[PDB]
């Protein structure tokens, strides 16, 4: 067919998020994809964050909550069981972000809530006391395919998050509602099911159900590897980093913290963390920096010879150099 819809059995958060990766990058776009799941105790970090810094990895092993790391920037999510999560894909150029959201709006209503779209990634419902957001979501895009993932608000216990994250100083000197409260009874399934409907009507075309799970793979290409390095260690957590220096700052953009040793007045090996968008320039930064002279004037040399090859991301980068131009000598 032209649908392939996949429900989730469990609340293995890598299992999950393995899935939610393979139909973006393994899959085919030849068809249209709903993936609906849900996640026990996670703190889902993006991918150029250190949770060392992030979390309170401690109090985490204590209280049994998971960490998992996804192949998109951006900051840290928690995720209960009174989280619905979706995800939906399609191929271009017929796919755009309208389409999911018309469809998770259509399923809201059909439930009995009064909702609507708020800026790009939000859903909103209207009340009387006030517009009560219960939905985040993000978007993600390719030369082939589109994909639109997010999560809803049922009966997530909203007071979780600061439990498992460290004061990040620089971030703060720089609504939220369940479902549950307006529709007492609201449960996972029965929004699985109002967004599956959805997604049929708006198709004109009704598929089975493949549910899936870890002790029962899905019918997906190189799952197994997938799921094998998103449930690793050394994928989510990885070594603490342990160097002599530091820079850091918070920019509007995104915080970034860059580790490094000196050796020789020459920079030996360097780091960096964000929880921007768009981590990669800071990437190829970091490995610009090797063998660098420990020097401001130095340090925009290489920050600079890369503005050709990341022209979406020009504003951003020379807020960086004229930052490690003041903040080094
Ligand atoms: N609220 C924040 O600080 C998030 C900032 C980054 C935005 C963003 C968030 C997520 C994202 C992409 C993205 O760009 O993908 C996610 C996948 C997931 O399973 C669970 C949670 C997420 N969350
Ligand atoms: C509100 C917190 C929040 C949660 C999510 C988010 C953003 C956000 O701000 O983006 C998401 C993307 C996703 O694929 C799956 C799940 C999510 N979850």
């Known amino acids: 067919?032209?649908?392939?819809?996949?429900?989730?059995?469990?609340?293995?958060?890598?299992?999950?998020?393995?899935?939610?990766?393979?139909?973006?990058?393994?899959?085919?776009?030849?068809?249209?994809?709903?993936?609906?799941?849900?996640?026990?105790?996670?703190?889902?970090?993006?991918?150029?964050?250190?949770?060392?810094?992030?979390?309170?990895?401690?109090?985490?092993?204590?209280?049994?909550?998971?960490?998992?790391?996804?192949?998109?920037?951006?900051?840290?999510?928690?995720?209960?069981?009174?989280?619905?999560?979706?995800?939906?894909?399609?191929?271009?150029?017929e796919y755009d972000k309208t389409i999911s959201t018309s469809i998770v709006l259509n399923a809201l209503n059909a439930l009995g809530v009064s909702a609507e779209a708020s800026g790009r990634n939000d859903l909103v419902v209207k009340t009387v006391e006030g517009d009560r957001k219960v939905s985040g979501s993000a978007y993600r895009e390719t030369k082939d395919r589109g994909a639109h993932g997010g999560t809803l608000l049922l009966n997530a216990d909203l007071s979780r998050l600061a439990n498992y994250l460290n004061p990040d100083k620089k971030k703060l000197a720089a609504r939220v509602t369940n479902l549950t409260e307006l529709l007492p009874g609201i449960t996972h399934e029965q929004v699985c099911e109002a967004i599956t409907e959805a997604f049929f009507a708006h198709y004109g075309e009704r598929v089975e159900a493949e549910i899936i799970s870890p002790n029962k793979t899905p019918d997906l290409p190189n799952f197994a590897e997938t799921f094998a390095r998103q449930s690793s260690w050394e994928w989510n957590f990885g070594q603490a980093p342990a160097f002599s220096h530091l820079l850091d700052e918070r920019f509007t953009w995104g915080g970034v913290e860059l580790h490094f040793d000196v050796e020789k007045g020459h920079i030996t090996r360097a780091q960096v963390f964000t929880d921007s968008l768009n981590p990669a320039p800071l990437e190829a930064l970091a490995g610009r920096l090797q063998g660098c002279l420990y020097r401001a004037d130095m340090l925009q040399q290489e920050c600079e010879a890369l503005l050709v090859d990341f022209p979406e991301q020009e504003k951003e980068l020379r807020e960086l150099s004229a930052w490690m131009a003041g903040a080094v000598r």
């Open 1 to 93: 067919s032209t649908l392939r819809l996949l429900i989730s059995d469990s609340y293995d958060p890598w299992f999950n998020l393995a899935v939610a990766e393979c139909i973006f990058r393994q899959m085919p776009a030849t068809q249209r994809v709903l993936f609906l799941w849900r996640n026990a105790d996670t703190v889902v970090i993006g991918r150029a964050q250190n949770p060392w810094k992030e979390c309170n990895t401690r109090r985490m092993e204590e209280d049994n909550v998971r960490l998992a790391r996804r192949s998109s920037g951006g900051g840290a999510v928690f995720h209960d069981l009174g989280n619905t999560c979706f995800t939906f894909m399609a191929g271009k150029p």
